[PDB]
């Protein structure tokens, strides 16, 4: 009775081209796609418009030195971006760019002409250029008490998740699907409601975030306690949803060695195009209408489920290392700089970002 | 977007959503935009 999903998996593997690279070239198609709207060149007038519109934080690079306007709406997110730029700036040509550190992208596709803004997440309906989010170093959500200074240090979190995965080999993992997060999108509601109706099937509960105003923000129940990502690994089936934009949760779940259930296919981060449905994770319809069938399928095809989980874990382990993040920043900014059709001059009043 | 939904405030500070802006009200002992600095 599972032939349909089984054939989809076979088909998806037949389509799959594994990335054999030892560097971040796996993702070069993402850079190429994101820069396609600017292939006619980025003029000085275009840059002045982006800056005037305050769509992001204005950075400049000249003579391998980084300069920035005074204002950054989220200093910790600017600091996280700066961490990676400063790592690679000795090899970057002169350029300037506007780096949006808000959650949401800034350049809808219907805007003509396209203007260049760097954002961490988009859909295909935006012309923003994706960059590796600040949180790979610092500045992700400060979820009290588990991440009191903000979710960050991907290098360390990788180590902790791999160790947790080793403590929870697949056959020892719990078969109840699992989610702990806040109500950043109502697309999450059907899972929380299914969990309340069928708690043996799904354990999905709303935590609160710093915008909480009332019980509406948790669908009328007391907020759940926050749970460290390393404590997700005891569950075989881990759900991932959009929030405001894409979520930082996603990459972590793979390293548990658990099978990721990824809901929807619109909101991206730069690495998402290399993660393939049925190869690396289970795709779930945006409206969750097939979630019960998918959960029955994986339980009845546990060998297939494990193979998918192992492939997804291996992809993040091998192709989303800290070095891949630094590499992507370097290749992204180097390629982008080619499309600036004029010579950048440091702006009056921009301090240098050291060291 | 209410910028507080992504918890920009560290160290159990309170986030206030202003017109397309945010403010972190620190617990005593902390300061800075994100309440990241120990006073
Ligand atoms: O109990 C929790 C709740 C959240 N998070 C993490 O905190 C971040 C913010 O999660 P939330 O669901 O609040 O918002 P999102 O960013 O997913 O929209 C994500 O990386 C979550 O994985 C967590 O580790 N444990
Ligand atoms: C990156 O890897 C590709 C092969 O995957 C190779 O062609 C390229 O030369 C490598 N680049 C560097 C700078 O190592
Ligand atoms: C599996 O986890 C679910 C949800 O947290 C829990 O209700 C259930 O008791 C667990 N089962 C076992 C066998 O540990
Ligand atoms: Ca706000
Ligand atoms: Cl935001």
Author numbering:
A (entry chain A): 31 to 385
B (entry chain B): 453 to 491
Question: What are the paper's exact sentences on this?
Answer:
In the POGLUT1/hEGF12/UDP complex, the presence of the Asp sidechain at the i + 2 position of hEGF12 further extends the interaction surface with Trp174. Among the EGF-like domains studied here, EGF(+) (C1ASNPC2) and hEGF12 (C1VSNPC2) do not possess a diserine-containing motif, while hF7EGF1 (C1ASSPC2) does. Of the EGF-like domains studied, hEGF12 and EGF(+) contain an asparagine residue at the Xb position (C1XaSNPC2) while hF7EGF1 contains a serine (C1XaSSPC2). In all cases, the asparagine and serine sidechains make a strong hydrogen bond to the backbone NH group of Gln240. In both the POGLUT1/hF7EGF1/UDP and POGLUT1/hEGF12/UDP complexes, the serine hydroxyl is found only in the gauche (−) rotamer where it is hydrogen bonded to the sidechain of the catalytic base and positioned for nucleophilic attack. To explore this further, we assayed hEGF12 and EGF(+), substrates lacking diserine, and found that they can both be readily xylosylated. The ability to xylosylate hEGF12, an EGF-like domain possessing the C1XaSNPC2 motif found in 36% of POGLUT1 substrates, shows that POGLUT1 has the potential to xylosylate many more EGF-like domains than previously thought.
